[PDB]
Symmetry: C6
Subunit: 202 residues, 6 copies
């Protein structure tokens, strides 16, 4: 990271590997990635991505997304030989740390004002991670129906777990409740809160 270039710590390295081992591409992996990559350089981001073993389908999908974003960046911000000793503008492949050196990355990130290549690359990675999370999501919200014996709260957990991978209350949530709870919910007037709905089916 940049704090000066600090090395990624062992605690950070291990935390990212473990999260991926234990949670695959469950949605909460994304904010953990983002938090664990606080201050990160493109190199640090590549380091973190490279340490993931397995999920190589997902990881290759992630490269495709990163590429689309690199190419689009080159469209919006185009770039002879550079002025000697001066700071060049970064191409998309520089933001991803493919054609840039660590010193160049630090240069951009600490420049006054900053070209925050870390934060830009992170944004791209997260775009790709979100696409993966939807893909690895096993179920459509349309198929989250409350079991005949399922407590309302557990249903709601599934409902919103599923929804996070891809107003909700007033449409599909009541619709997809089981008959007993659906009747009770319908009897509550418009504009009922989730707290209220859950109390009423407890």
């Amino acid at each position: 990271p940049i704090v000066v270039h600090q090395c990624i710590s062992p605690r950070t390295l291990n935390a990212w590997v473990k999260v991926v081992e234990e949670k695959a591409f469950s949605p909460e992996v994304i904010p953990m990635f983002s938090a664990l990559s606080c201050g990160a350089t493109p190199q640090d981001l590549n380091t973190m991505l490279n340490t993931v073993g397995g999920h190589q389908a997902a990881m290759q999908m992630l490269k495709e997304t990163i590429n689309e974003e690199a190419a689009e960046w080159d469209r919006l911000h185009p770039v002879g030989p550079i002025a000697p000793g001066q700071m060049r503008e970064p191409r998309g492949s520089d933001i991803a740390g493919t054609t840039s050196t660590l010193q160049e990355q630090i240069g951009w990130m600490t420049h006054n004002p900053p070209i925050p290549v870390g934060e830009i690359y992170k944004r791209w990675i997260i775009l790709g991670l979100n696409k993966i999370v939807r893909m690895y999501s096993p179920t459509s919200i349309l198929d989250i129906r409350q079991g005949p014996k399922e407590p309302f709260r557990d249903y709601v957990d599934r409902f919103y777990k599923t929804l996070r991978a891809e107003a909700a209350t007033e449409t599909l949530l009541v619709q997809n409740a089981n008959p007993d709870c659906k009747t009770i919910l319908k009897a509550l007037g418009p504009g009922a809160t989730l707290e209220e709905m859950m109390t009423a089916c407890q």
Copy 2:
């Protein structure tokens, strides 16, 4: 958190501690003070980071947004809001929750002399919501905590006050043997005294 005045990253130890607490204790009451301690110094972004890392409990987490919203809207009522160039704008409710504010703005408010402590304000909101969740996930009313016929007084009292924390009766709801003894201590007895007398 905040560490010329600049954002320190949330540490891995902090991140993991919060996830684990939620995994192991769900919405048992002591999760709240742990959240508060683990979020010492936190910016709104750090608070959002911590909340977002929770997997599961998405009913609870959506309930939490509703509460946060009520508090945001009420804040906009009490403290209403083009801004002077290069000066510090006043934060709306959605800025305190880190929805419409940047990290730099959050640091700005928090380190301003005097401080607008948007971290502490947002934390207060989150805790309001966390308390509502804790009551919800509380399985039992204090009215239903009755001492078992063979239950030692101390275990009863643990349950009594466990239940009460999630939300006279104590003697009332004791079992006949211990109720008689307690009544004989008469007014003003301490809990230590009650517990000794039924040991």
Copy 3:
């Protein structure tokens, strides 16, 4: 704790206190661990630590009663118009316990020259309460620690002093064989000597 400014309680500290209470309940050595883990602590930090304890809510309520007696007694010995502007007010008992005081006030008192050490005072109260709890949860009277007919002397002595810590007799309560030997050492024998003689 304090560094003049508040350092956050660390995750390692938070977890250590929770684990100690989970694993050892109110065994006597929990007290010195609490005291060590709360080194430097503000009243807020002490409340944070106490609040993170799940379970034992009977004990925790007992602890409040004790804290209250000590708060009231403090108000007796050190009584307190509106304060001089911008000057440091004297702390009431409820301020020492962090109930009616702010963090800044706590830091104020603790770092003042000379210090009003509200952290150390509150800690002293908590430990008073923790000691009462430890005696309560102590299962056995020292009067009932008798050496088994087949029990090695050392194990007896461990139990003897374990029990005694939670709250002459030692020789008295030894088993016949070892009692005879001990009596033969006659007055002024050391514990090392007693234990060698019954090994």
Copy 4:
């Protein structure tokens, strides 16, 4: 590593490297972990880390051969001759970069010189060359043998495909070819230029 003076390798670092090797052997992701754990490393630190590995001594000896080829090639490109100028900084031979004939002070000297001779980063590059050769060796399967099972979900196939490939455009050639008949037909119907995301959706 370096702080101008040598900081010790930390216990956390030492243990992390040993554990990675214990748990993952020479699976590909060991390499970037080695590289990250050896951030800031001196040649001595790199030797320390390599020496703490128990087992895999075939691999570790193979690694020396590779390091040697790179040392010798370095001596070809950057030669040295007489006795050195008193009190001055000598140029490093290949065996100096590997920390075999160099002192810690010399390593720090080169690494912190203005401008730096980054002997740590050079030696690391060599080690990684050798680690890659080992990873291919310990790779059990050729990409040519990664065929989708008749009941294997496309995604699992793709995981294996690219796991295998990492140890040694791929989509358009062998990936479709080696898919199972049902999914191969579907993929062929998408025709040129399909993305991996698209292929995977179509066989889900």
Copy 5:
């Protein structure tokens, strides 16, 4: 410990000492671990560490007796009206043990130029007591460490010297070897090293 001001004992330190005692009781190597974990310690820190030990209360009471003998002997060798105002008093034995001294007084002595190292003195006392405990909890006399008829020489030697360390080679080691190895060892005759003895019975 000390940084002039008191640093708190760390949780890592606290836990390490408790665990050592839980896992190894009063095996000899607990002593040097205690000493290392108590580097820089004040008398208060030493009391803190001793107080966190649960169980072994016989041993812990024995330890007080030893500490007392050393306190009283210290008062004999270094005897002590009311003190000069604002000046540094001389420490009595009970001050070194942190019984009648404040933390500030302990820091005072320890950081004075020149130092009265009350931490190191108290540590020395504690270790004296810990050694007496280690001998006590030692189950076996070196006289009873005999090599089993099937026991490899090396294992015997481990036990021999384990036992010997708790009490604190040309004689008893050969003597107590089993017949087969005893004959071989005797044939090496005077002046054999342990390395040589062990090779010869491997």
Copy 6:
């Protein structure tokens, strides 16, 4: 270790790491470089601290003293041996921290130029640790023969594991018939990578 230039305490992480390594790996060869890394910056006292925390292996630990002594005595031979307030020269027993104080150790180590008593003592300890590692080594390289069903790579692991505790002369010789024939056909100058590919 060392940071008035002053002694930093050995950390709990360091202390525990050394104890655990010895518990889990005994005197397998890789314990040595771990000892050396964990004892980075160490004073003689720190080295004694680390050695003293080892429970068990007291045969080995006594053997280690013998080796340390030989090296102490030899040091006294090569460098024989005071002015008020000045720095005395260290005897062998001073390097091992037996007759020296912590302050003296720090003195030597931070003197300009340094008398690196930590590094010297470490060198001695490692000499002794190496003798122990050979001793606890169960097998001679002469007895590492490839099993009839053993994959070449596993054989090579054993070969070099064994060899480290104490190449392609004995390595090919001791291979199993099938692989030995193939290896011999590669003829002089084959690399280990090549040998291993050819028997995979």
